[PDB]
Structure formats: C-alpha cells, structure tokens
Amino acid sequence: GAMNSSNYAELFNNDIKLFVDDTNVYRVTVHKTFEGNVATKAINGCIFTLNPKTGHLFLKIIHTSVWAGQKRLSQLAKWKTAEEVSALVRSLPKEEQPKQIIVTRKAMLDPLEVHMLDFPNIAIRPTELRLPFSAAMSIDKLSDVVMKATEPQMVLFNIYDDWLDRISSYTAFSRLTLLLRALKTNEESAKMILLSDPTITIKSYHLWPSFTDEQWITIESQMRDLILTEYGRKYNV
C-alpha cells in the first residue's frame, strides 16, 4: 500500500526497507544541432537506493553506454532501474534483504514488481510523500563519483555520516530531507549556508560538514528560512 504521513514511523522500525528513487537515472542535455534541429546528449546518472533506518545508500552509477542504440530511453530507464535493484537484492545475504521497497514515483511500481516476482514476500509500495531525493546530485561527493565514472559501478555511502551516534534515525531522516529540499529549491544558497564557515570542514570520509549539535540547529534554521524565503520569492507573498 501507499506510504504517507499516518504511518511515517514505520520507516524507522526494525523491518529492513529501501527507498528507490529513479529521477537521476536517465539524464540529458538538450542542444541545437548544426542544422538547427534539437538532439539530446546523455550524461552519467545514478539510482538512489537508501535504507532510511541506517543511512546506507547504494548508489548505482548509470554510465551513458547503457543507452547506446536503445529506443524509448525514458521507459527503458524505469526497467533498468528495476533490473539493478533486483540485482542488488539478490546480491545481499538473506537476512539483509529488504522486506519492503518504496518507490518514489508510481511509474516504478510495475517494472519493479515484474523484476521481483521471484521475491513474493517483498512488498513493493508507492508513497504519497514528496521526497527531495532528486537533489542527491547537489551533494558534491556524490555528483563527482557519478560524473567521473567510466563504467557501470556501485558505490556505497552512509548519507547520515556519523549522525546516528547522536540522534535517532527519525531525526537524521528529517535533517536529510530538509537539507535536500533546500538544495532542491535554491542550490547556491543551500551550499553557501553549508560552507560559509571555513572552520567547519567535511571529513574525507563524510558528505556533510562536521557541525556540532548547536551548529546543526542553526544550520537547520537557516535552511528553513531559505525554503521559506524561496517560497516567498516564488509566489510573491
């Protein structure tokens, strides 16, 4: 069934689950050709597969070569996503396989369900939550590994850095979605907010800066002000 605001704590219970976002799988630049027609050039993409309890992110990089000579690429991308998620589940020991997979766009439901017929006990679900996982490519270290890749490749991250040492997964998810929402609404400002203090660095083995508890509250406030600021610029309120 659909995941929404009524059953939101289910994300953080002890049943293994993954979110799958396919927004950034098939990415193109659109340009004019010499003859003045339009054509696309594809660039590297990625599947964003995330355990919201642990922060474990399975970043499957989608190299442009996987589109070569294929037709109807927007449709193929949903099936390529479903094929790679199925491949991931099969590669995991049984006790690590998810009990549920939540897709962020409903168009992923059939492709994934078809690829996972072999796993009838894994529930494939949509969600009414609008999650900002498309902004994942505003995270510099993630964007860099996607663009540098010369072959298909899976890279594993913890998108919560070390936060779970200090906060619950519910709070770490809330932080993450507010950070991603901010980067999605105004990327420049969000990054400005995150780095304006050169004395807070990003550890080589982390994605986000090493903010103290107190500094995270400030940062969170500034991000909410930004999302409100942009809402105001947008709708003229």
Partner 1 sequence: MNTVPFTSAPIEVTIGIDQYSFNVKENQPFHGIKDIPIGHVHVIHFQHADNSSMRYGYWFDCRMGNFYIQYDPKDGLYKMMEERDGAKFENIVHNFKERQMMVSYPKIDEDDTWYNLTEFVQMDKIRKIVRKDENQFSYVDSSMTTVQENELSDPAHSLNYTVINFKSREAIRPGHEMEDFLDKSYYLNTVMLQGIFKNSSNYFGELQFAFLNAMFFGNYGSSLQWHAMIELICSSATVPKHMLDKLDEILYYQIKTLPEQYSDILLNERVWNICLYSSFQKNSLHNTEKIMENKYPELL
Site residues, partner 1 (CB under 8 A): 76, 79, 82-83, 110-111, 113-115, 117-118
Q: Rank residues 83 and 230 by Cβ distance to partner 1 and give the closer one.
A: 83
- Residue 236 falls in which region: left (phi positive, over 0), alpha (psi -120 to 50) or beta: left
Structural element, H or E, at residue 218: helix 213-235
Q: Based on CB atoms, which residue is closest to partner 1, 4 or 75?
A: 75
As measured in angstroms, the least distance from the Cβ of 96 to partner 1 is 22
Calpha distance 204→184 (Å, rounded)? 24
Smallest separation (angstroms) from partner 1 to the CB of 74: 13
Q: How far is the CB of 87 from partner 1 (least distance, A)?
A: 12
Give whole-number Cα distances, 15 to 10, 122, 205, in Å: 8, 11, 28
3-state secondary structure of 38: strand
Minimum Å distance from CB 117 to partner 1?
A: 5
| Tally: H helices and E strands in the chain | 6, 8
Whichever of 82 and 135 has its CB closer to partner 1, that residue is 82
Task: Please identify, using beta-carbon distances, which residue of 50 and 108 lies nearer to partner 1.
Answer: 108
Binning the chain into helix, strand and coil, the percentages to the nearest 5 are 45, 20, 35
Q: Which is nearer to partner 1, 84 or 161 (CB)?
A: 84
The minimum distance between CB 76 and partner 1, in angstroms, equals 7
